Design a binder for this molecule. Structure first.
Ligand SMILES: CC(=O)N[C@@H](C)C(=O)N[C@@H](CCCc1ncc(CO)[nH]1)C(=O)N[C@H](C(N)=O)C(C)C
Length: 305
């Protein structure tokens, strides 16, 4: 149909503090969740079946991300480290040390030979996956780094910060290519590249999402109607059915917009706290959503469209 009809299929309980992030494995089999409870949990994407707990961080986790081959995870923790995990064994392969404050955000490149991280220490770091060594420290921002993401060929990194900036970095040199958003305020709470790498989706803590043309440095679309003044809420491109933008909201709902028209096409009700994180299944019309401390659950929603 022209609009989605997402309906609740499963509620995934087990975290003992706020959930911080959910991400589907690229092969579609798994959902990974991270939590302030210091744990990663792995769940079946299709039936919500609890698979395993992955443990080792000494403080809460803000983010987790999958390698391209679905075999590895990287997590970002308040313990000032990232950890690379073998999903099959649950073992920590590498501990990435160098940040001087909470690690907030992380991602693999498409090649999955590099990890990018952002920290409360106001830096972006680029790490070698094989050795766990820090290759580059970028003095990226002047306040905590809220998001980091590689583009589809891995040649670019986009970063965002509470300093109000969005910057694009040349991966190879670590040098800045452009400052896409250059305001004192509001905080830029989330950024990522579009699937094709031509656009950047950016959240600001004034209840606004924007789709930017990277090359032209111009705003193409604005999405509003949700509540986002405090938390670094993820946003997604939904591409399996209709072309949507998806985001959590501080009114405890999942918002779904038509990417082209900017109209709200669905609001998913059921969580009892802020929806901090949403993820879109790579092949099926499935959304995962996760909520803060009142709720501490993940919900799986399925649409015909
Ligand atoms: C472990 C922890 O909570 N660390 C502090 C520093 C924190 O505030 N982390 C944030 C992480 C939000 C999720 C996120 N990761 C990456 C993005 C976008 O790139 N968004 C938070 O709101 N935590 C919640 C809070 N402060 O209430 C909960 C999960 C404790």
């Amino acid at each position: 149909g022209s609009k989605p009809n997402y309906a609740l299929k499963f509620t995934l309980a087990g975290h003992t503090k706020a959930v911080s992030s959910v991400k589907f494995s690229p092969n579609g089999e798994w959902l990974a969740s991270s939590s302030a409870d210091k744990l990663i949990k792995i769940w079946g994407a299709y039936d919500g079946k609890f698979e395993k707990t992955i443990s080792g961080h000494k403080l809460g986790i803000s983010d987790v991300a999958w390698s391209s081959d679905s075999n590895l995870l990287v997590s970002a923790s308040d313990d000032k480290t990232l950890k690379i995990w073998d999903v099959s064994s649950g073992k920590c392969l590498k501990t990435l040390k160098g940040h001087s404050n909470y690690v907030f955000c992380c991602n693999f490149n498409p090649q999955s030979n590099l990890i990018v991280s952002g920290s409360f220490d106001e830096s972006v770091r680029i790490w070698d996956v094989k050795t766990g060594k820090c290759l580059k420290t970028l003095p990226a921002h002047s306040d905590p780094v809220s998001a980091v993401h590689f583009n589809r060929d891995g040649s670019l990194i986009v970063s965002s910060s509470y300093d109000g900036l969005c910057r694009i970095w040349d991966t190879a040199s670590g040098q800045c290519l452009k400052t896409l958003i250059d305001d004192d305020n509001p905080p830029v709470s989330f950024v990522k590249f579009s699937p094709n790498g031509k656009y950047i989706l950016a959240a600001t803590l004034d209840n606004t999402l924007k789709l930017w043309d990277y090359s032209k440095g111009k705003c193409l679309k604005t999405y509003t109607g949700h509540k986002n003044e405090k938390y670094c809420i993820f946003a997604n491109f939904s591409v399996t059915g209709g072309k949507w933008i998806v985001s959590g909201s501080e009114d405890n709902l999942v918002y779904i917009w038509n990417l082209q028209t900017k109209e709200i096409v669905q609001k998913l009700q059921g969580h009892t706290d802020v929806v901090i994180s949403t993820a879109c299944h790579p092949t099926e019309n499935i959304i995962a959503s996760a909520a803060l401390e009142n709720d501490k659950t993940i919900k799986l929603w399925k649409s015909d469209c």
